[PDB]
Design a protein around this nucleic acid. Structure first.
Ligand SMILES: [Mg+2]
Ligand SMILES: [Mg+2]
Ligand SMILES: [Mg+2]
Ligand SMILES: [Mg+2]
Ligand SMILES: [Mg+2]
Ligand SMILES: [Mg+2]
Ligand SMILES: [Mg+2]
Ligand SMILES: [Mg+2]
Lengths: 169, 294, 112, 72, 159
RNA sequence: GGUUGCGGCCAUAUCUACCAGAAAGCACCGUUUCCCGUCCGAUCAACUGUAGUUAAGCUGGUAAGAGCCUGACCGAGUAGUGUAGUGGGUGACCAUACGCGAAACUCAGGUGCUGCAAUCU
RNA sequence: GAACAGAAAUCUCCAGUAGAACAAAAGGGUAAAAGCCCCCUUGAUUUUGAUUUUCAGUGUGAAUACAAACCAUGAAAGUGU
RNA sequence: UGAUUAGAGGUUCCGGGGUCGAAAUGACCUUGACCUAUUCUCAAACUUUAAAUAUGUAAGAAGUCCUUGUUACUUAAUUGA
RNA sequence: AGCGCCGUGGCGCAGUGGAAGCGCGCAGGGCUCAUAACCCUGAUGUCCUCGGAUCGAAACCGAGCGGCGCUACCA
């Protein structure tokens, strides 16, 4: 039936994969911390690759995970930039989705010439209550099939919320 | 079409132990716990098994045999109403009281209670049950916290402290008790005593009742219904401790029924297996309907 | 015989040392050519090229010696001689690139 | 084909025998057993071989294939 | 050159088995060994400490020493023209109790019970085992068992 | 008989797809002052048992289910093999005598049992 | 599945009995680990003995299990020569 | 695990060809791979399974049972060894 | 047959884990009446093939292909 199987936002992860380390990475991290209210975490390259100009253990990206009401606040702040319009490609087969934006000033962030301009990748992980069966330490289990979120119910949720429309296929 | 497993995979799959599949036992820890110095031939090794569920604390004294584990004595948090604790049956003080109760219970049923009185005047100091001379050694038991995280302030160590102050000899250091300052490697006894007597919930009750009354009515509703204010829980915990030291004798319930009386209704409710002949009849009817051209 | 081997070891080591020595004087005279004398500059380049080719050949022999020949005692001096040959090699490479670069070629014009 | 195999036998060392098998082709069933199996619908041809219906397995797939055997 | 290490030719011997890899069950640690017990040696590849040499795999010996996590066993090794006694310190994961010894102890107490019983009657217990004696006479009937005649079969290809 | 804690043997217990689950118990669940830990009170920690829900977990059942397990005078006394011959055969190898004796295959059946303690219409 | 970002950069979910990794040859062994990350450390310590392999039951090398100390870690059982 | 024969059914938002094509997360057909269910033949350094022959031990008096003596070992304990 | 070397631009050759160059040729422009010479520039590679180690190499370690050189003695 439908007692407490409502699709809530588990988390929103904001990723910024910079081409290199240094001042630009620190500036992107300052963008992320003034946006999210939390300090972000940097991510090193898994291996060397010459055509992208990165070495192993280089700190080439920075991301942050946001939960709670601030998650949907930043999400609607990005959705109004995306015109409340998303491709169905943007929705995963497991029920999660995401979208990338450029030029983060669209989110109402007052520009400072110190930090500069950065594009981001939003990804939204959705689930139902009872998701800690797979996350807890003791008596770890797997979520049932009728409780698994998927693309059809998450696009129905996303359309009945936000008054949004999905794009063609 | 996607979530499929091959017959070779299912034939080569080695299932773990059943408790591992259930996710309830760490066998790596169990081997180090239950094994004995072989020159102590049949000497049992005793585990203080402390488990925390929602709404309950389970304390057991358990030895191990080859056919299974054997319980000396158990103490649950839901029988603290015998001793005057009605609310907060999973907090730190309830863990301490359960540890003290199972310690006194095992000491009484072993006869080691008139000696090894434990700590009567509780003040929050760190000390173990020392062996009294000219007499028997104290009963030795080791913790089995299971998969629970060792953490400074965790109430498994409140159960530890309760069992140790009850007169049991359980080996431990003090760097996991609340009040252990990290940079100054010492224990603060007064914060530990406050945690024993529930100061950490009484302070919350006060700093909620002063400003946010809707939360203080949502939770702590039972304290409001039973006129329990913040300062009283210290003395009801002291009275529960002295009642525990008065009689840990484990009066059980009257059960309201019999084993077969429960079993009749549950046997009526449980689903049964489908026998071979009726399974064959089922598949024959499935052939006659599905494959019988509708 | 290990004796005949170590004999030719010592022979190549003294040949390498005198080759380094008549490389270094050509190097410093290249740096002191008074670069107006461009003919003498190019002569000094082509003169130290022969010496570094001789040392390169000796280095290949040292490579084979350390690989297969069971030198059995003198890994140290064979390695130090190899390090000196290769440092003279990159010295010659810096010299020869410095003369080979052209003043308005694209490699000169992008980054001084 | 007996003469072809007899001609091919000269190219081999040792002794070889030419045996007419009682099996239907490259299968493992005898001729009348395969005949009484194929008059019903429990055979289903493949590229060159043939798949058989077994009493084991899911009834749904067993009826999805071999429908003529189940159309009794 | 030749190779005779401590674990030469132990490839399949110290393999674990099919589908019982991983940790060992707790009965091996819960079992109690005493001085004079008779134990069989079967090495466990999962436990690398205290392993027996490959010669002693499947060998049966007598316990002479009990330590914290190990057991001293005495084996008779055939060396040259005589046996030598070999003292082995083996962790208990490579050791199990011999079942023949306890089945002999049950036979001992059963013989004791028989003797103690029949001492009150004097009926000549005859406590020794006896081999399989030749079977004595019997009369087999044909009622519902008329003999069925068999014959050798001719040759057929069967391909 | 159900359930919880601790287990023993470690798939007859696992896996895939559905269905059901009185009571209680577990569970999801609610909160962030305190101890504590995280980029994130998601995990971990603490508090409440209050606001709710059996949706999931968990238990059970179903499936000519996969897998697994047991048995067969099913294959087959076959393959192989110890011993014997001044046995056969140019040889390769193969029969016979006294003995031991499989695996796959096929068919049939089954799909956790159980220990200590506590609790439940 | 997610801007630049593509076959390969970073992030998220699902499946995943090991198809990876464990300095090196190959072979065993290992999944709340023996793998990866983090914290603390020096037990890679002292005193001599016993035992296993090679074997003459000699040596050398390597290894095993205890005893007597002094320590490390961990809540602890324990583990560490 | 590795080797290996032959077809069948499929999958390309995703191999190479042509065709209808301006192209299209378009269409038809050809050929390669990837998957599914089959099929033929194999392994000293592959294996679920697994013999025969060889191989270790035991079949008591130095044994068993009952009772209670020693210890500085061991146990919470006259508990065990 | 064994051993050792070599294989890089069109030709002859260098080349050490952060990774392809020297000379002559070739192309464009200039000078010259014109061509050489000369001046200013530019382009040029399956690093013999195949696989592996490495985070990564032409280099390190293997399989062959091709071409060279040394030895093949005592009767
Ligand atoms: Mg642990
Ligand atoms: Mg084996
Ligand atoms: Mg070691
Ligand atoms: Mg660990
Ligand atoms: Mg030795
Ligand atoms: Mg030690
Ligand atoms: Mg020109
Ligand atoms: Mg000209």
């Amino acid at each position: 039936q439908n007692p407490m199987r409502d699709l809530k936002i588990e988390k929103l992860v904001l990723n910024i994969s910079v081409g290199e380390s240094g001042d630009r990475l620190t500036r992107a991290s300052k963008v992320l911390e003034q946006l999210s209210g939390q300090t972000p975490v940097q991510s090193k390259a898994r291996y060397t690759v010459r055509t992208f100009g990165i070495r192993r253990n280089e700190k080439i990206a920075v991301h942050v995970t946001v939960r709670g009401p601030k998650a949907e606040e930043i999400l609607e702040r990005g959705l109004k930039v995306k015109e409340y319009q998303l491709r169905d490609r943007n929705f995963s087969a497991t029920g999660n989705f995401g979208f990338g934006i450029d030029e983060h000033i669209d989110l109402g962030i007052k520009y400072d010439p110190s930090i500069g301009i950065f594009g981001m990748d939003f990804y939204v992980v959705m689930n139902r209550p009872g998701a800690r069966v797979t996350r807890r330490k003791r008596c770890k289990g797997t979520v049932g099939n009728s409780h698994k979120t998927t693309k059809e119910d998450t696009v129905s949720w996303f359309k009945q919320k936000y008054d949004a429309d999905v794009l063609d296929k | 079409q996607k979530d499929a497993k091959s017959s070779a995979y299912s034939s080569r799959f080695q299932t773990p132990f059943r408790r591992r599949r259930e996710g309830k036992t760490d066998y790596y820890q169990r081997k180090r716990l239950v094994t004995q110095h072989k020159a102590k031939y049949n000497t049992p090794k005793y585990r203080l098994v402390v488990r925390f569920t929602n709404k309950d604390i389970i304390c057991q004294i358990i030895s191990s045999t080859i056919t299974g584990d054997v319980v000396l004595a158990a103490a649950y948090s839901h029988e603290l109403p015998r001793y005057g604790i009605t609310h907060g049956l999973t907090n730190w003080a309830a863990a301490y009281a359960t540890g003290l109760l199972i310690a006194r219970r095992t000491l009484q049923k072993l006869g080691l209670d008139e000696t090894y009185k434990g700590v009567e005047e509780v003040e929050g100091e760190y000390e173990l049950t020392e062996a009294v001379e000219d007499g028997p050694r104290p009963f030795k038991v080791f913790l089995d916290i299971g998969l629970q995280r060792t953490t400074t302030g965790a109430r498994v160590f409140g159960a530890l402290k309760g069992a140790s102050d009850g007169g049991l000899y359980v080996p431990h250091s003090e760097n996991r008790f609340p009040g252990w300052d990290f940079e100054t490697e010492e224990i603060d006894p007064e914060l530990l005593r406050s945690y024993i007597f529930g100061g950490h919930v009484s302070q919350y009750m006060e700093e909620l009742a002063d400003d946010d009354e809707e939360r203080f009515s949502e939770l702590f509703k039972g304290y409001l219904a039973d006129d329990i204010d913040a300062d009283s829980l210290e003395d009801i915990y002291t009275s529960a401790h002295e009642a525990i030291r008065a009689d840990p004798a484990f009066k059980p319930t009257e059960k309201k029924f019999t084993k077969e009386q429960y079993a009749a209704e549950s046997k009526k409710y449980r689903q049964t297996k489908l026998s071979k002949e009726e399974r064959a009849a089922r598949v024959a009817a499935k052939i006659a309907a599905l494959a019988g051209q509708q | 015989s290990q004796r005949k081997l170590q004999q030719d070891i010592d022979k190549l080591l003294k040949k390498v040392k005198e080759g380094i020595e008549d490389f270094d004087d050509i190097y410093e005279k290249f740096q002191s050519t008074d670069p107006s004398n461009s003919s003498h500059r190019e002569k000094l380049e082509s003169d130290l090229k022969r010496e570094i080719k001789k040392l390169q050949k000796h280095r290949d022999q040292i490579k084979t010696w350390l690989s297969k020949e069971d030198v059995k005692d003198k890994q140290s001096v064979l390695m130090t001689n190899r390090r000196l040959i290769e440092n003279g090699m990159e010295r010659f490479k810096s010299v020869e690139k410095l003369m080979k670069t052209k003043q308005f070629s694209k490699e000169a014009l992008t980054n001084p | 084909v007996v003469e072809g195999l007899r001609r091919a036998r000269y190219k081999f060392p040792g002794q070889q025998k030419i045996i007419l098998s009682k099996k239907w082709g490259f299968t493992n069933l005898d001729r009348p057993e395969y005949l009484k199996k194929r008059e019903a619908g429990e055979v289903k041809d493949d590229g060159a071989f043939v798949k058989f219906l077994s009493k084991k397995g899911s009834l749904e797939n067993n009826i999805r294939e071999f429908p003529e055997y189940f159309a009794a | 050159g030749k190779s005779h290490g401590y674990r030469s030719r132990t490839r399949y011997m110290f393999q674990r088995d099919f589908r019982k890899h991983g940790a060992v069950h707790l009965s091996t640690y819960l079992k109690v060994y005493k001085v004079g017990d008779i134990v069989d040696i079967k090495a466990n590849g999962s436990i690398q400490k205290g392993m027996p040499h490959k010669f002693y795999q499947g060998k049966t010996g007598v316990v002479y020493n009990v330590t914290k996590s190990s057991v001293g066993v005495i084996i008779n090794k055939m060396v040259g023209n005589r046996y030598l006694e070999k003292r082995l310190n083996l962790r208990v994961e490579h050791i199990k109790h011999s079942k023949c010894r306890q089945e002999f102890l049950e036979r001992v107490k059963a013989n004791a019970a028989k003797r103690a019983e029949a001492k009150a009657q004097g009926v000549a217990v005859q406590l020794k085992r006896q081999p399989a004696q030749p079977r004595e006479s019997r009369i087999v009937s044909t009622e519902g068992n008329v003999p069925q005649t068999l014959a050798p079969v001719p040759y057929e290809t069967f391909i």
